[PDB]
Symmetry: D3
Subunit: 239 residues, 6 copies
């Protein structure tokens, strides 16, 4: 029946999707982010794509999981774009590339090394993956007001942390001053920008670079997730 | 508690995982494949990873979804490997690159163009992505016995079907004789082989190269999925 | 005699150079920028490097020409770095890559395509060339207050506008949404960042993408140069 | 006179060439292979190309030397193709990349690393160089019946074993699990497949990875050559 | 017996090989070149390698065929080097890339496009393939004295003239001003130089770029071969 | 007024520029070279471009500085070409890549490694950067007659001697037998040749590979500059 008008992966349309969007890897994180919003509604659920609308401080925002990886991210960006998204903020996870960065502290990517094939499918790797400065301004301002430590800088996005060369990759990138590594940021920044989106990425640190420990760690991380979501929500509701 | 011994993404361990494994993109396909098996048990559910064991014609086999894309595939291969997998068969979806291939017909990848960054993270693209011939032999033999049309040959694996150049990519690859395109096969074939797995990929055609139509199409596709799963099950239970 | 302590190309030392620096292509532009400052002093003059200190609204700033091209830019960045520079702003020239951009209007590079070999000597082209957001914030704020049109976005930096393929390069990059093209920005952004500098680039448009005309054009361009210099000065004197 | 209809390098035509073909490096090996056949006839002799027809167990097969290297291999593949070849099997020599492989033991290439420029002239190195499984099936079956040890897997094809880096190349490829190295296999597999041939490669080991010794070694190698030829003949006469 | 001291492919040793060497593709050309010399002796015959010594105007020179292609050329260069060669001149065949060049006219390669994988195995393609100027001087001087037309400039060396893109390759390279194309020159120039040889290449045109005709063409070509050989001999006997 | 007919960077036209040209990096070197000539006239002065005509032994020659780097070199080559230049000789500076080469000794580049992006903008790096042999002949002949040591061979042209990897670059290139390194030679050789110029490069050594010392060093270097200029002048006035 109504299977003609919907985007084939995110399963939503023009009218459903807000111009303002948050994406994350984990479908179950979508339910956690909507907890913070009013007037929540499930829009679609398909494969790794879980899509909700919610209202935060008066502004209607769409929350969308995209699974792990640049290809699954790019699929959601293209289809969100077609539904009228203009501002998209990644809220995600990272492994630290500097030893001073603790669990549940935030990395805000100003730029990203394009070490994933996803963005390369579109354009020469020479094209920059960077965050919209208007969004960065707002993110910086929200994060200043609170106590959890956060770092602005370059992250690396890649397609595997499981090569035998992971150690050396880490060390090389540590010396270049990269803050953290994910799989999705540079693809958002590249494809998003090429489709005229304003984009940004707020990453929760979940691996150190280096029983009761476990519980505090998990709490720290869960606190970082919440902060990252709130920061993204605070930023989008100003536009 | 018991969060020390499990693989951090597939959330299973050595003892749970069979040496014989089927992977697919869609978590909901895992439930559909287990329908065909005895002694089914849910092993884990995490992000896009849905993991089950089942028994088919006496052999215990593990079924695992890996979401869409090479990075999420590679994560599952590495972790399945560490749990003792030896034979892994992709059961997935493809877009046709030749016009004679119909919906719900199967493409069996003998080889795959490595147009995804995932496999490139591991090794120079010059290394071949090809299917284990023992598995190909068995797949060919099962498929001969039945009526649904199937094609053996080269597929292309890539990170985006949404570039502005998709048309030209299609036409170029059509002329080279590629049968279909997916996102995951060449990564399985490359990483899998480099970790000593026997690997294969059986792909269900879901896009032509070119209301009642819709219902028969869906039936055709659902029939192709079932055939692909059965073929993989028949192949693995012989080892 | 005192030819031991000075940088071998910019011919200045630690004590001479301010942490705050403006660089431009043309040595004669250095004299034009110092016209706008108090307490001017010639520091060095060597090859294409013309170096001055001046004071603007209380802040001491160094002005340095670097000739044309990424290699000559990189030489000045490395040596300015060694003399203690922390903030460096390019004030330069561009050819428009969109037809709405007029002569003597400004392009502020948020990011830059790394199509020059200079930055590639240092690091894989996958590393992002982008502008420090703190500087971008300040530049945006100054430029809002006045009437001359200015555009924020991506520029392309390259090593030749004289290949037979220039037309096609232009058209390709026009469609990607690039605003202008220079030879120096992405090298500043890449090497500068890798040496821990805060960096930015304000470019004066001097070629349309498309006697009395000539005089107004020149006036427009000279007005853009002055505005670009003033904007950079206003930005640096706040740090 | 009749110098219009013949292929300019292999000096044969449509009518002469069988659909079933064996190629080898060494012209003098052609005479050794025909020793095993009935109804032998010299077809052509030109540069490194020595061409014969023979009959084996009822089937007429063409034997063709192609000298050393991918370019000279590719020339023979293109021209054999134009003469109506459909199945082509390389029967050649390899240097071992694992220490358990002895002299005069066989390596059957399922796939090949495309480290030669020959195949790259045709297509991106991402395209797979692999052997036709129907041929692999048959080769496996013949070789099972006899006592000489043989290994199935990946070989590396390259353009020089004389670079100063040969040692490190060897060690790198040894760890990746490559069985042996030649100069011709991946070019056959790539160009052959792109021209719609069924292809395979059976390689005789002639260098260990590590007077009376010399005589037994030579005998071992000569025995491997004979076995490789017989295996290829047994395989082709079944089609 | 004496199978320990000889180079494994060219089957000659230190004492046999002159410092001055001519190489060509075709073994039968070796017999044609020795026709022009005194005190001829067959040194070795192995695969595509046919090796002779002869004396020309007092100087002893070695003549060696290397079959077709860069890999087989490189093998002979490495082994000739080890036997004490210092000056090596290619005497070969080319296809014209400009329409004014006739059959049996000579192309003398000053430089060569490195479009073959052979030289790339050794060193980045950025390293120049060019001819020793001392040899070029002497070649120019001999050729001035006679009537057959000859052209000095850039040739292209490649691994296949049989790709579907040959036409476009030709046209692209024609416009760049390339004179002719072979398979071997840039490999000689690159590997040779890296091993400290003085190198040069004199190529006989055998394909236009565009019964009685056939006979005059063949005569023209055979005349070009003779001239090329004589020119190389005249050049080497001066050292 | 007369700002229509002049080249936009070198600020000269067809009638001003001689077919015979010397280029150097340093504008102040132009004044030093004209000291050696009769009938000197300043033609233009713009940015790093300082342009003069002079007469040497009857021949009128143009002297042009091009600042440091391949992009600024290429600009001058293109515009000199358009003004009718046919023969262009670089007279420049190098850092030694072999320890036997002393300060103020000359390196004459027969060929150049294309490690700069400038030439790559035009053509695949596989195209050779080499010197016109007619010019090399003449340069060799002049330099034989005098006492200062000079070396003919390969140089490397690059875009930065300030990467953290400079040491290793040096060592790698030392072993390959490179004589010296500059920033401009391979760009002249590549772009120049592609525009049909006869080209050459004579480089003065100013850095060893390894008060009174300082004065003799400077004298040695200044003597090398003079010799290089004279050699170029002697060479051009013969055409």
């Amino acid at each position: 029946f109504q299977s003609m008008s919907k985007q084939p992966h995110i399963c939503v349309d023009e009218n459903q999707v807000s111009p303002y969007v948050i994406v994350c890897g984990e479908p179950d994180r979508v339910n956690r982010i909507v907890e913070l919003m009013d007037n929540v509604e499930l829009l679609a659920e398909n494969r790794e794509y879980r899509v909700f609308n919610g209202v935060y401080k008066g502004t209607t925002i769409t929350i969308c999981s995209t699974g792990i990886g640049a290809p699954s991210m790019i699929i959601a960006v293209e289809e969100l774009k077609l539904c009228g998204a203009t501002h998209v903020i990644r809220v995600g996870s990272a492994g630290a590339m500097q030893d001073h960065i603790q669990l549940g502290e935030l990395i805000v990517a100003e730029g990203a090394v394009r070490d994933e094939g996803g963005s390369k499918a579109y354009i020469s790797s020479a094209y920059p993956a960077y965050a919209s400065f208007a969004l960065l301004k707002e993110i910086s301002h929200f994060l200043e007001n609170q106590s959890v430590k956060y770092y602005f800088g370059v992250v690396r996005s890649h397609d595997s942390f499981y090569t035998d060369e992971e150690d050396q990759l880490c060390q090389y990138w540590n010396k270049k001053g990269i803050l953290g590594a994910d799989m999705e940021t540079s693809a958002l920044f590249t494809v998003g920008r090429l489709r005229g989106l304003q984009v940004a990425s707020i990453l929760n640190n979940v691996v150190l670079y280096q029983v009761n420990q476990y519980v505090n760690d998990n709490k720290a991380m869960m606190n970082g997730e919440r902060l990252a979501a709130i920061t993204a929500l605070e930023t989008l509701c100003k536009q």
